[PDB]
């Protein structure tokens with residue numbers, strides 16, 4: 001009924017990695033192409049997502065064991081999971097009070113209608129919002145939020161990964177940390193671990209729907225030209 | 241291929 005030295009180190013590493021790659025001031029948003037409220041929100045949200053991918057990559061590189069993987073496995077894990085990590089880390093700015101994502105000022109407050117003006121439909125956005133409120137209602141500790149992100153990223157069951165056994169062993173270590181953390185440090189958390197694993201399963205369904213809608217978007221050059229080179233690379237279909 | 245990812249993954 002106690003966390004080990006190695007488990008505590010892993011938590012401290014992941015929390016620090018998250019603080020180093022998540023800006024609570026949202027001060028970089030003013031450097032994106034501005035919001036316009038045709039797909040009027042596509043430039044701004046493309047820039048937001050591009051920025052997010054960079055942060056997700058920076059977080060990944062500080063996950064214990066991630067940098068020891070092959071470059072090909074690191075890419076394979078990021079290409080498959082980046083959209084899910086973005087959905088997870090967007091939960092911090094999500095607000096139950098008006099079902100929107102508030103990133104600083106009123107200009108960087110996004111509702112469902114804003115994302116439809118970037119090319120997405122309710123078939124993605126309705127489950128996405130229901131995902132966000134259910135995740136928000138979990139009231140995760142920071143430690144649990146960063147562990148769930150790292151567990152999602154280190155999933156061996158993605159297309160293109162080669163060292164399934166090494167990646168699974170890393171993910172297993174993180175799950176054991178999460179389970180022990182909820183046991184010792186999260187009061188009334190009897191069913192919390194199972195609820196978090198279920199959230200990882202919801203994310204695969206969101207991933208699938210977003211990929212469908214991203215393909216439809218990015219096959220039209222008048223829209224793909226509004227994306228960034230990083231978005232095109234990471235969400236694209238090239239294989240190593 | 242993956243020009244930007246490879247770069248960003250270096251340090």
Ligand SMILES: CCC(CC)(c1ccc(OCCCC(=O)NO)cc1)c1nc(C)c(CC[C@H](O)C(C)(C)C)s1
Pocket residue numbers: 021022023024026042045046047048049052055083086087089090093101103110115118119120210214
């Ligand atoms: C709906 C929520 C929202 C947009 C408002 C979101 C994303 C990231 C957020 O990041 C929080 C703050 C980061 C930070 O501060 N990092 O440090 C906050 C909110 C998105 N969700 C998804 C799945 C999106 C897919 C984009 C799409 O595919 C195209 C751009 C190609 C059209 S856009």
